[PDB]
Structure formats: structure tokens, C-alpha cells
Design a protein around this ligand. Structure first.
Ligand SMILES: NC(=O)c1ccc[n+]([C@@H]2O[C@H](COP(=O)([O-])OP(=O)(O)OC[C@H]3O[C@@H](n4cnc5c(N)ncnc54)[C@H](O)[C@@H]3O)[C@@H](O)[C@H]2O)c1
Ligand SMILES: NC(=O)c1ccc[n+]([C@@H]2O[C@H](COP(=O)([O-])OP(=O)(O)OC[C@H]3O[C@@H](n4cnc5c(N)ncnc54)[C@H](O)[C@@H]3O)[C@@H](O)[C@H]2O)c1
Ligand SMILES: NC(=O)c1ccc[n+]([C@@H]2O[C@H](COP(=O)([O-])OP(=O)(O)OC[C@H]3O[C@@H](n4cnc5c(N)ncnc54)[C@H](O)[C@@H]3O)[C@@H](O)[C@H]2O)c1
Ligand SMILES: NC(=O)c1ccc[n+]([C@@H]2O[C@H](COP(=O)([O-])OP(=O)(O)OC[C@H]3O[C@@H](n4cnc5c(N)ncnc54)[C@H](O)[C@@H]3O)[C@@H](O)[C@H]2O)c1
Ligand SMILES: CCCCCCc1ccc(Oc2ccccc2C)c(O)c1
Ligand SMILES: CCCCCCc1ccc(Oc2ccccc2C)c(O)c1
Ligand SMILES: CCCCCCc1ccc(Oc2ccccc2C)c(O)c1
Ligand SMILES: CCCCCCc1ccc(Oc2ccccc2C)c(O)c1
Lengths: 268, 268, 268, 268
């Protein structure tokens, strides 16, 4: 009955139940998908969080900066899904940028070591995961990553904006590689969502009026979006990622779908 | 379990069983939608074409330049679907440009009367169909128009390129109106498909260069698309339109979804 | 030694001494250009206004909707500039939209007759003027038109936004034709300037909240521009046009240069 | 008389007399500018090369990955130009990418260490040069970097495409900081030019595919550019950079000017 009936899908990036990846996983499961999950660092917490999903799925450790984790990933996925089976979908929902690279911290004062780490995790890892997983993906498959529209500069997002610009470019080359396997590669550019990264990384770097200034972001985004925007609701974004993982967008690759309430199409 | 089960959808633009609109109607019916079709000019002929669809659907006359057809449209649709019921979707799959505006005919020699006619039918009509139909659309509903990426100039498409550019802009303003109703408005920028218009209009205006240009279009597009492109197969485009008509892209509006094999994301 | 020393340049669009074209003309003559001016409708007024320029230039009548004017234009310019001389530059600084297509007047209520007149004058005439003048332009020549970034929808600009979208597309096709003559074609997307068109057309259609709403546009453009924006100063825009008329951007064609304080590059 | 008469301009990125920076330097001196040059590593040979410019100019060592070099840069330039004098122009004409990041080497096989070096040099350094030099730049001044349009993926350019996508994003935030000083920041996206990096980095990484790949690049570019394109001629690009360094584009910042024959505005 489900949009993703029978499909085996790897989903990275769950840390809490407000994670975009959590809702992607939840919707994908409501739609009949069989999941393999990956988690970073706080595996015990992640285990407890994933207990809240509609169906239990194996959790595999993946630090995208750890070459050993990347080299063993496909083997460990095959152990979880069974020999002779392959993935139909992969979700990259991963990002990091040091505090120096965000908020009210002067753009010029972020050392390259920090920026590099951020670009490693948030951009290059999209290609790493594709490298690791394409060899175990079925024709008609779909790789999806999460974006935040970086076409224009803005307060606060700072070097993460630069990392997203890189990610968009990486996705276009991932499409070229993926196409050899009959696999699509796309990004979903989401509007703002109240996640752990929002409050701890972005909010943490904004200093004092962070609470009110995020409320400004919500109000302004919902005003610009012709159909409105709810920062408390990741479901519209999760649904969009599932549309891309499905058979219903079979001719879209190297591309970006905007799940932002149409805010990026309006100036005011 | 159909993607569009229960949905009432108006589909304009069928003229042959190669029409992008025809495959849109076919796929939508396969997925449980209940359709109303609109046709232009030769309605007796169109009815024999629509007879080839999987299921019966009422066929309505609509010339988008005819003010009376537009003023009566919502009432005629309401009769077709039953008083009390509203539309969940609307598909604009219509375009025209006079020969002077196309092909090897010099760009400078198209009189404005001819360009204006093409822009009326191909761009302005997206707004006039939205005006007529929004008052009989449900929240969560979806308006979708057909686009051919006009961001760059090219041989042969000439003034139709300009009409498409206008249409993309018209779509962003329709989104502002549609949102007041909880309705989304998007275009699908399709790759090249073997349809009547490509033959009679584009081919016709290319004269002796039609063959070489159409061949280059078939193979060049496939070459550039990372997942490839079958110009003889409208299904991938029709599926993309159904995705937009569905509940699975609920946060996208005023936007363009590219069902072109990824070709627009690659230079070579 | 002036930027445009010895260049023969046609400049359209002067109506008042606040007109963008007036400032283009002044800066161009300050830089050694020999001008021919074209005016519409109010020829006695334009003659008077142009008496304020650094040098007296011949003024020719041109209503871009008048086929006879267009058909006789090259002949009339050749008279103004001398037989055996050709133009080095052409400036299109022309636009119109009926009130129904602007301001607080509902988008859906603008009749196509109104929209078509707006598009004729604002977009199609860029090609009309190129058709007329390219046969009397020197290699290395430059055609420049005035744009307002229409990539996103916005309040008030309405159907003019659609006309500018069309204009951008027209410019790319003009470039194809102009290249056959060794001539470049480009647009300058300017930020908001206090001109007759701004007060009469835009402010006129904004109703009672107009003078203040226009002030709020200034405030927001200036805030978004990393280098600020002064709506009272056309000179930075005129300078940019002069740069495109000069020999200093010889590799730029089919393109758009933004003289907008950089506001389009920033989200907030 | 000269376009840049009286201006003091720093030009980085000279490595051979085919360097785009060499032609920028030459044209700038021809136009009355006083230069300070920076070079990397091979300073003995760079000095030999700059002795062939029309005018004498101080040459300073700058490795952009060297923190000590950047920390001391403003003081060294001040020594070169005289205390109390400031720079009106800065040209960043610097890029690097390891071979593994380029050509026919598999996109997925580039280790992050290699990509990170390329991004540091090719993108981050645009920000570090701005950080170092803005304190000694005059209001009305101009920072210009060199781009190659990375909006679409393509053969061979591989991870350098990613670095350019990052660089474009960096330029937009540099614009925010530069505007506090009354300074503009922009990129010139150049068409392809035969330089040391083309030969050694791009051509070297293509191997047996270099001939065919570069022929198609060159043929396609000249075909698409409405005014044509000559890969052997850096002067149009050098002129465009000088236009940006001048007073003639005073309202453009955070932006990208294309010196590419108009190629990017045309599909074919
Ligand atoms: N929250 C928003 O408003 C928003 C908007 C647009 C895009 N995004 C993108 O959505 C994605 C999900 O972020 P979120 O908002 O759900 O935040 P989140 O805090 O819920 O998730 C971020 C994830 O990044 C993972 N991560 C960090 N370093 C990692 C590493 N080295 N290896 C593997 N995983 C690592 C963390 O474990 C965490 O699970 C990110 O790409 C984010 O940039 C978020
Ligand atoms: N075929 C392609 O390669 C292609 C690619 C991208 C986008 N498109 C767009 O797809 C849409 C459908 O085109 P298609 O290729 O299926 O061609 P088609 O010939 O099958 O359909 C074109 C339709 O336009 C309708 N039409 C013309 N004038 C009309 C009027 N006054 N009122 C109402 N309808 C009118 C025709 O009757 C016909 O049904 C158009 O917007 C077209 O530009 C086509
Ligand atoms: N003022 C702004 O904020 C702004 C911003 C960006 C772009 N522009 C563009 O700059 C250009 C000049 O406008 P402006 O702001 O200087 O206003 P303006 O009123 O000074 O100039 C508009 C000109 O258009 C001419 N025109 C109208 N109909 C014509 C016709 N049929 N034939 C020939 N000419 C006709 C008018 O006579 C007038 O001279 C237009 O393209 C406009 O869209 C203006
Ligand atoms: N050649 C083309 O077709 C082309 C086209 C568009 C853009 N570009 C860009 O133009 C710029 C100049 O390239 P080019 O083609 O003239 O090649 P080039 O080889 O002449 O110049 C590249 C410069 O980068 C410098 N560089 C490398 N590492 C450095 C470091 N650590 N510190 C300081 N400098 C360092 C090199 O010394 C060299 O001077 C680059 O940004 C390049 O990406 C080149
Ligand atoms: C106020 C600035 C506007 C941006 C807010 C939206 C947002 C929130 C969180 C996001 O995720 C991250 C951001 C930075 C670093 C890491 C992650 C996952 C993210 O990518 C985007
Ligand atoms: C070089 C590219 C030329 C072929 C483009 C593909 C195409 C084919 C048909 C299309 O439909 C029309 C084109 C013109 C007029 C009317 C219609 C429906 C259309 O909009 C696009
Ligand atoms: C509030 C809307 C956004 C600000 C508009 C700035 C502007 C002002 C005048 C312009 O010129 C015209 C506008 C409409 C019709 C005709 C012309 C010449 C124009 O093109 C742009
Ligand atoms: C076939 C590849 C596509 C055309 C490349 C044109 C080009 C050539 C050289 C360029 O400069 C560099 C490229 C890589 C690394 C460093 C530099 C300076 C560059 O940035 C662009």
C-alpha cells in the first residue's frame, strides 16, 4: 500500500526525535520501507531515540570522518539486509560546523581547520557515502541529501552557507557517478526546522537575542512562503524526501527540490 | 493503493495519444484519480483520443483565448464533477506559437501580433485558468503547468523560449494567489518528448533542418542526462506531474521541478 | 580621455531629468560620446529637458509600438549621425505597464490586452530596436537595456515582473543576432530609483500607502546592499551602462549586470 | 586618460606569462595603475617574468596557506607602496587542486586531504586575502577573484568545480565585510584560457583523454559564445577585471561578471 513498499533504505543523521532524519525514517516506515539506520558518536542516546520509530531497524555506527567506518560500511549494510539484497535508497541528513564558523562570530575569524572540518562532514561526506553505497544499490535507486538554500549570503549561517554551496556542487558530480548504476542523486532544500542543530549550533552561535531572532526567522519565513511555514513541523520535509526516494520522481537527478513553503521564489 | 486515490483532477492539453497531457491523464487514472479533461478546437477528434484512456472522463471545451469559455469553466467543471465537489488538481499542458516565432524563421521577423498570441496561450493562460479554477479547488490542492527550461537561449525554440520565461514568472505570482486557498502552483520543466507540437510546430518551422535538429535533440539530451533520456517515453514526465498532484510534495510552491533526466544540471 | 571618446551612441527613454536614460546620456557625453536621442509622445518636453545635457544632441521621435517609426528609424539615425557613419552603441531604457497590471490591483484582474501592451513596450521592443539598428552598427558595438531582477515574485511589481522575465529571455536571443555583427547585447538590472515611472506607474498603483511604502523599499534595499543604495542617485546605474557601452567588457553578451548595491546577492 | 590612472592595485597569481594575472597586470599598467605583485614559491622565476611587464612593480611572496605570510602581508604592501598610501584594488587570481581531484581520476577516489588543500587555496584564501588587505584599502576600492562557472557539473573539472561553488559563496560573504570599508567584492567567471594550470593541472589529469576533451570544450565554447571565444587570448578577461577595478561598476558587489563570450547564456 505504501509509497516505499518493499524498498530497503539507509537513513543517516538521527540524533533526536526532532531530527529531520527521524521524521524521514518515520514516514518511510509508515510507507512500507525497510530501514537500516546510521548514527554518530552518541550511539546509546540514538538507540533510545530510534526505539520511538514505528518499526525497529538496525543501527550502524558511522562517523563520516572515519575512513575505517566508510571502508566497512557496505559490508556491514550487507550483513544487516542479507546477502543477495541491495539498497534502493540512501539518505544523507548530516551536517556540522564549528562555532567559529557560525552566528555572530566574525566570518574572517574562522580558522581554516574549523571550516575544513565543517566542509568534510557537511559536503564531502555526501560523496563518501555514495562511494561506499553505490556498489550495493539497485537500478532505480535514489540518494537524497539535505540542503539549505545558499544562493545568497545571510546573517548567521556564515561558513555553513559555503559548505551548502559545496554540497550542491558535490551532488551534481554524485549524479554523474550514480547514473552509471541507474541511481538518482538529489538534494532537498528545507526551510528552517527546530532541530538540535538549529538550537545548539545555530542558536548557540547567535549569542544574546538568539531566541527572539529565531522567532524573527520563523515569522519572516512563514510570511514569504505563499503556503506558509511551520518551524515545529518536519513532516512536510520528510514527505518530500520520501517523494524522491519513491518511483514518482524518476527523471530528476543532480538537482534540488525546495521544501521551503515556496519562500525562495518570493522576494517579499 | 493509488497515489491519487480519491482526487479530482482537471487535465488540459490532450490532442493526441503522444500528448504529454495524455500520459498525465493515463498515469493519474492508473493511480485512482477521477478526471475532467479539457480540449481545444477539434473536440470530436479529441474525444476519440481520450477514449483510449484507461477510464471514462468527461471532456470539456476550452480555448484559453476565449473569454466566454473561461467565464463558464468553473460552472461546467462543477457540473462534470457534481455540485458540492471541488478539484484537488489542475494541469495546464498547453502551448502555441505561430510559425514566424519559431524554427529557422528569423527571430527579428516575428510580428508582435504573432508573439502576443503565443504568449497569451502559453503563459497568460496559466493565470487565467488559475483565476477560473481556484474558487473550486480544495486546500492541499495542486496546480501544475508544463515548462521547457528557458534560462538559456537556443536554436529553434525562439519566441516560445520567451513565452516560457514569462510563464515561470507568471507561476511565481499564481503561487501567491493559490496560497490564499491552501493550494500549490508549480511547473514541471520536462525534457524533450516526441509530441504533435514538436513535429507540426517546431519541426514545421525548422523546414529542411528539422531532421538534424530533432536527432541532435534526442541523442544530445540523453548524452547530457546522467540517468539518460528517452524522448519517445512520456511516462517519467507524467509520473513527476502526479508526484506534484499528490500529497507528497506539500511544501513546494511557486517552483520548477525538472523532469529532464538531470540534463540541466550538466554542461557536457 | 573619455571612456566613450568618439563613440556614436543612440539613447532612448529620456522623459525627465530624473530618467535613468537622462543620466546615462549625461555620463556618456561627459565621457566623449556623440549621442542621438529618441523620445516618445512628449517631444517638446524632451527637447527642453535635453537642453540640460552637457551637449545638444539630435532628438528623433520613436514610439516602439509604431511600425512606421521603426521602419524609418535607421534612415533617420543615419541622417542625425551622417551618411557613412554607424552607431557604436544603443541604449534601450523604455518600459510601460497599464495600471491594472501594477500595484494593489489584483494580479488576476489585469486583462491580457493590458498585459500585452506592457510586454510589447517593455520586452518585445528590445528586439524591435535591435532589428532596426543592428544594420547600422559597427563591430565591437554594444546594445544595453534596463532590467529589474524578476527571478522572484514580489508585491506591486506584478505584471511588470513578467515583462522583465520576458525581456531577459529576449536579451539572450538578441545576443545571438547581434553576434553576427560583432555586437554585444546585455541588460543592467538596476535597484530602485526615483523616476517618473516609479512615481506615476508604481506609486500610482499603490493607492494610499505609497509614499511611505516606497520609502520602506529604499530602507530595505539599502539595508540588504552590502555597499548601501541611494534611490535618489541614478549616476551609479548610468556609469554601469557606460561600462557596457565601452570597450572594457568585450567578452560579455546575452547577460545581466546588477547595479543594485549587491542587494540581490543577500537574503537579509 | 588611462582607465586606472592613479590607482594602486595588488595582483596575485602570476606564475608564467600566460597567467591570467599577467595579462591583468599588463592591461592595468597600460591603463595607468601602480601595481604591487604577489607570487608563490617560485619567486626567482616570477621576478624574471614580471620584469617583462610594461612597468616595474614590487614583488612580494605570498603562500595563502601560510599564516605568517598573511599576518605580515598588509605591512609588507604598506612598505612597498609607502606609508599613508592605500590599495584601491586587489586581484585574487589563485587556484590549486591535487591531480586526484581532477581529470579522468575517479571523483570518488580523491582523498579529503587533497580536496581540502584545493578548497583552502582556491576558495578560503579569497576570504583570508580580504581579511589581510581590507584594513589597507581605500573607500570605492575593489576586490576581484577569478571564477569558472560551476553552476553545472562537467567532465574533468571535478573537485575544482566544488571549490569554485564554495568560492562563489565566499565572495558573497566577503561582500558583506568589504562593504563596511566602502569596498566592492566580485568574481570574473572567465571562459577557458591556455595557462600553466590548464596545461599542468587540467591537461595532466586528463591523460589520454586530454586531446578529445579539450577540443570539445574549445569547439563547444566558441560555438555557444555569440561573439565567439579564443582560448589563446586572455586580454578580454584582463579587460573585464580592469573594468571591475575601475570606477565604472560602482553599484555591483557580491556578484559574478561573466567574461566568457556569452557562452553561459546559451544552451547551444
Ligand atoms: N534544521 C533546519 O532548519 C535545516 C534546514 C535545512 C537543512 N538542514 C540540514 O538537514 C540535515 C539534518 O540536520 P537537522 O537540522 O536534522 O539537525 P540534527 O542535529 O537533528 O542532525 C544533524 C546530524 O548530523 C550528524 N553528524 C554530525 N557529524 C557527523 C559525523 N561526523 N558523522 C556522521 N554524522 C554526523 C549528527 O549526529 C546529527 O545526527 C543537515 O544537513 C542540515 O544542514 C536542516
Ligand atoms: N514535447 C516536448 O518536448 C515538451 C517539453 C517541455 C514542455 N512541453 C510543454 O508541454 C505542454 C504540452 O505540449 P505537448 O508537447 O504535449 O504538445 P501537444 O501538441 O500534445 O499539446 C499541446 C496542446 O496545446 C493545446 N492548445 C493550443 N492552443 C490552445 C488554446 N488556445 N486553448 C487551449 N489549448 C490550446 C493544443 O490543443 C494541444 O492539446 C506545452 O506547455 C509544451 O510547451 C513540451
Ligand atoms: N526607476 C527604477 O527603479 C528602475 C529600476 C530598474 C529598471 N528600470 C527600468 O529603467 C528603464 C527606464 O525607466 P525609468 O525608471 O528611467 O523611468 P522613466 O519614466 O524616466 O522612463 C521610462 C521611459 O519609457 C518610455 N516609453 C514608454 N512607452 C514608450 C513607447 N511606446 N515607445 C518608446 N518609449 C516609451 C517613456 O517615454 C519614458 O521615457 C525601464 O526599462 C525601467 O523598467 C527602472
Ligand atoms: N585558465 C582558465 O581557463 C581559467 C578559466 C576561468 C578561471 N580561471 C581561474 O583564474 C585563476 C588563475 O588561473 P590561471 O588559469 O591564470 O592559471 P595559472 O597557473 O597562471 O595561475 C594559478 C595561480 O595560482 C597560484 N597558487 C597556487 N597555489 C598557491 C598558494 N598556495 N598561494 C598563492 N598562490 C598559489 C599559482 O602560483 C599560480 O600563480 C584561478 O582562480 C583559476 O581557477 C582560469
Ligand atoms: C539563522 C540561520 C538560518 C539557517 C537556519 C536553518 C538551519 C538550521 C540548522 C541546520 O543544520 C545545521 C547547521 C549548521 C551546522 C550543522 C547543521 C546540521 C541548517 O542546515 C539550516
Ligand atoms: C531546441 C529545442 C526545440 C524542441 C524543444 C522541446 C519542446 C517541444 C515541443 C514543445 O511544445 C510546444 C512548442 C512550441 C509551441 C507549442 C508547443 C506545445 C515545447 O514547449 C518544447
Ligand atoms: C514596488 C515595486 C518594486 C520597485 C520597482 C522599481 C522600479 C521602478 C520603476 C520602474 O520602471 C517601470 C515600472 C513599471 C512600468 C514601466 C516602467 C518604466 C522599474 O522597472 C522598477
Ligand atoms: C576540461 C576542464 C574544464 C575547463 C577548465 C578551464 C580552466 C582551466 C584552468 C583553471 O585553473 C585551475 C584549474 C585547476 C586547479 C588550479 C587552477 C588555477 C580553471 O579554473 C578553469
Amino acid at each position: 500500500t505504501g509509497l516505499l513498499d518493499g524498498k530497503r533504505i539507509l537513513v543517516s543523521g538521527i540524533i533526536t526525535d526532532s531530527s529531520i532524519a527521524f521524521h524521514i525514517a518515520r514516514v518511510a516506515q509508515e510507507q512500507g520501507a525497510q530501514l537500516v539506520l546510521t548514527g554518530f558518536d552518541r550511539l546509546r542516546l540514538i538507540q533510545r531515540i530510534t526505539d520511538r520509530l514505528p518499526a525497529k531497524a538496525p543501527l550502524l555506527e558511522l562517523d563520516v570522518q572515519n575512513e575505517e567506518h566508510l571502508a566497512s560500511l557496505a559490508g556491514r549494510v550487507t550483513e544487516a539486509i542479507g546477502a543477495g539484497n541491495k539498497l534502493d535508497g540512501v539518505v544523507h541528513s548530516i551536517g556540522f560546523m564549528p562555532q567559529t564558523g557560525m552566528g555572530i562570530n566574525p566570518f574572517f575569524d574562522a580558522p581554516y581547520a574549523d571550516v575544513s572540518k565543517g566542509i568534510h562532514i557537511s559536503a564531502y561526506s555526501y560523496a563518501s557515502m555514495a562511494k561506499a553505497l553505490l556498489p550495493i544499490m539497485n537500478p532505480g535507486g535514489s540518494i537524497v541529501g539535505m540542503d539549505f538554500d545558499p544562493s545568497r549570503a545571510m546573517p548567521a549561517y556564515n561558513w555553513m552557507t559555503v559548505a551548502k554551496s559545496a554540497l550542491e556542487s558535490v551532488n551534481r558530480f554524485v549524479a554523474r557517478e550514480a547514473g552509471k548504476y541507474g541511481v538518482r542523486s538529489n538534494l532537498v532544500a528545507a526551510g528552517p526546522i527546530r532541530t538540535l542543530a538549529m538550537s545548539a549550533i545555530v542558536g548557540g552561535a547567535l549569542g544574546e537575542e538568539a531566541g527572539a531572532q529565531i522567532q524573527l526567522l520563523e515569522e519572516g519565513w512563514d510570511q514569504r512562503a505563499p503556503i506558509g511555514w511551520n518551524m515545529k513541523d518536519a513532516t512536510p520535509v520528510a514527505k518530500t524526501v520520501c517523494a524522491l526516494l519513491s518511483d514518482w520522481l524518476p527523471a530528476t537527478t543532480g538537482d534540488i527540490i525546495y521544501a521551503d513553503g515556496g519562500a525562495h521564489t518570493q522576494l517579499l
